[PDB]
Amino acid sequence: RTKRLFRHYTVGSYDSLTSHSDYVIDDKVAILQKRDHEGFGFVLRGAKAETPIEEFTPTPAFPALQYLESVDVEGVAWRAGLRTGDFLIEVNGVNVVKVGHKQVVGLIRQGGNRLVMKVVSVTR
Amino acid sequence: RTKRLFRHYTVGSYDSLTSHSDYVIDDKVAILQKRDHEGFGFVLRGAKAETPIEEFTPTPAFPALQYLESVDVEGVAWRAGLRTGDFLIEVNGVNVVKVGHKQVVGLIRQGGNRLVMKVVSVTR
């Protein structure tokens, strides 16, 4: 049950034993309601781009362009289940995987006190 | 000056832009002082071994056998700067990179209300 996969490589009487653990992709939905003065409690970080970057290709390690660079502990987002490193997938019914920072920020701001997001967590 | 490395890969006129970040290996010393009844506030996880596994080979991905599965927020370890996924290098000055789980836990309990841990945070 509780066990990790290790690779045992051996050549010419030398051994190495290394761990090669796959990325877990864990999707969640967050609903955030704030007060007029308070923040949602997160710092968003991602690529600057005027238009979506079509050729952008999600990988297990990097699903999307905009991610949470930090989350205020016991702030609105934290309470809603958001954690540092979550990748933004959808923001108020808009797909944002490939979307530049300014536009995502603009969507979040159009929402006012309410923000509803699909995000993804990744761990190894 | 804030930026991220991507790889632009093209062949046969098909294009793919993927994140291509260098591993950031951050070593830190955490010093934990708990009260008699509180815990250090973390769950340690890693390979069982009655003796050190000498043939273990550290990689950027997976530097050591024991790591932080979870850290309770607002707890002692959290406040000391420890986070989920850190790899234990030293415990109370003793190298634990290749040390079995039972023995590392032992070293920790031996310290009483004090715990000094050298850890590394791997991010990409």
Binding site: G39, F40, F42, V43, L44, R45, G46, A47, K48, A49, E69, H101, K102, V105, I108, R109 | T2, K3, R4, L5, F6, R7, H8, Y9, T10, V11, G12, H20
Partner: peptide, 15 residues
């Protein structure tokens, strides 16, 4: 065919 590394700039925004 080619493979090229590029730094794309990123922004931070507290919300």
């Amino acid at each position: 065919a080619d493979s090229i590394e590029i730094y794309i700039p990123e922004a931070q925004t507290r919300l």
